[PDB]
Amino acid sequence: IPPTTVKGRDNYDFYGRVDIESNPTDLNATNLTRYNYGQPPGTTTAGAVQFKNQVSFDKDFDFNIRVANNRQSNTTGADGWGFMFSKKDGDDFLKNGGILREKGTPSAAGFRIDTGYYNNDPLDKIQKQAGQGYRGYGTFVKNDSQGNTSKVGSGTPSTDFLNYADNTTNDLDGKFHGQKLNNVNLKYNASNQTFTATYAGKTWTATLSELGLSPTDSYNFLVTSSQYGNGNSGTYASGVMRADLDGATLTYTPK
Ligand SMILES: [Ca+2]
Ligand SMILES: [Cl-]
Numbered sequence: 001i002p003p004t005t006v007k008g009r010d011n012y013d014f015y016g017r018v019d020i021e022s023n024p025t026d027l028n029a030t031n032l033t034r035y036n037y038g039q040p041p042g043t044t045t046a047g048a049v050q051f052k053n054q055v056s057f058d059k060d061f062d063f064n065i066r067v068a069n070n071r072q073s074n075t076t077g078a079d080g081w082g083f084m085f086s087k088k089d090g091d092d093f094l095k096n097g098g099i100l101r102e103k104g105t106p107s108a109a110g111f112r113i114d115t116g117y118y119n120n121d122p123l124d125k126i127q128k129q130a131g132q133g134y135r136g137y138g139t140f141v142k143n144d145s146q147g148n149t150s151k152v153g154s155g156t157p158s159t160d161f162l163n164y165a166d167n168t169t170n171d172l173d174g175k176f177h178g179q180k181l182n183n184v185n186l187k188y189n190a191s192n193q194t195f196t197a198t199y200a201g202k203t204w205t206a207t208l209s210e211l212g213l214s215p216t217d218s219y220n221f222l223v224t225s226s227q228y229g230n231g232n233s234g235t236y237a238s239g240v241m242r243a244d245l246d247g248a249t250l251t252y253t254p255k
Contacts, residue, residue, distance in 0.1 A: 003060065005251040009033075011052055012245060015090030018047030018225075021242060027068060027181060031246050033223075036078050036239035041229030046098070048090040049245055054218035055085075055252045057208055061188040065223065065248035066181035069115055070240055071165040074135050075230060078239035079116040080164075082224040083186050083197075084108050085213060090222060098224045099141050102149055109142035109152070109211035111186050111197040111204065115164045115241075118230050123149065127157050134165040134178065138199055140206040153195070153206025162200050176200045181244055221250070 009020075009031070021034040035047040055061050063083070070077040082099040086092065086108040097104030099112050102121045115136040117129045124130070127137040137160040140153035165179040176182060178200065185198045193208040193215075208215060227239035 001253055001255065003251050003253045005249055007247070007249050009246050011250070012049040013052060013090060014047075014049055016047040016094045017045055018049060024242070027242070029181060029244060032068075032242040033245035035225035035241040036227040041227045041236050041239065043228065044094070045228060045239070046094055046224065046226035048093050048098075048222045048224045050090045051221045051250055053252070053254060055221055056218050057188060057193070057213060057215050058190060059253040060190050060251065061186075061221075062251040063186045063221065063248065064183055066183050066244040067113070068181045068242045069113075069134075069164045069178045070238065071134070071167070071179040072237040072239065073132075074115060074117040074129060076235060076237035076239075077116055077227070078241045079114070079118070079226045079228060080136065081113040081115075081184070081241065082110060082222075083184065084110040084222045084224055085211075085219040086222060087217065087219060089220060093222060093224060096147065098222075098226065099143065099149060100224070100226055101228065103147045104143050104149060106143055106145050106147045107212065109213055110140070111138070111184075111195075112141050113138050113164070113184070113199060116227070116230070118228075123151055126151070127160055134163050135161075136164040137161055138197065138202060138204060140195065140197065140204055140211065142210075142212045144212070152210040152212075154204050159202070162202065181242075
């Protein structure tokens with residue numbers, strides 16, 4: 001079987017607090033997939049789109065999607081993005097969590113673009129997330145067989161750091177602006193058993209061993225976001241996170 005590349009909304013199931021924003025006012029785009037709209041932070045403020053067919057790590061995988069982060073502080077906005085492999089589905093993600101906190105569904109792994117501070121997350125402490133502006137980070141993570149999340153693969157706090165938004169409105173400066181649509185590339189090279197993620201001009205690397213995933217078992221792939229809340233002060237904003245799912249590309253090899 002040769003690889004195929006698919007594109008289109010119809011290739012994904014929608015779970016939880018995810019919808020389509022037909023006509024964004026602030027982005028050059030239509031029909032964006034939108035997370036965390038119309039609901040305050042809490043246990044159920046989470047969403048996933050799940051590719052309808054399974055992948056396995058005997059074969060290459062390549063996924064590209066443009067994402068646009070909320071232009072909201074890390075104490076008011078969303079938790080981030082989790083590009084997650086799981087043997088279970090989007091309902092299991094809604095029940096048990098993902099890869100954006102300290103614990104989620106067991107034996108999942110993937111790439112985390114972290115945009116939200118949580119007072120009980122030890123990785124947010126390591127990564128120096130607390131503070132002003134739009135402080136976040138990228139990294140691979142895995143959930144162990146209990147669900148506990150840990151950083152895996154390349155990076156240090158200094159190199160993982162990224163400003164996930166800014167206050168500018170210019171399209172001429174040659175700079176990254178995380179509130180605009182910017183591609184995320186997540187790929188897996190079966191020949192060297194290595195996952196690569198790129199975003200914001202930065203790269204991260206992790207082996208299959210480091211992610212803890214099976215070399216042969218079938219996995220689902222989910223694009224997740226959430227806004228679970230950081231305490232109960234009532235200080236929050238919309239947490240709206242958007243992705244061009246209709247324009248995304250996913251390359252895999254069907255059985
Ligand atoms: Ca965080
Ligand atoms: Cl449509």
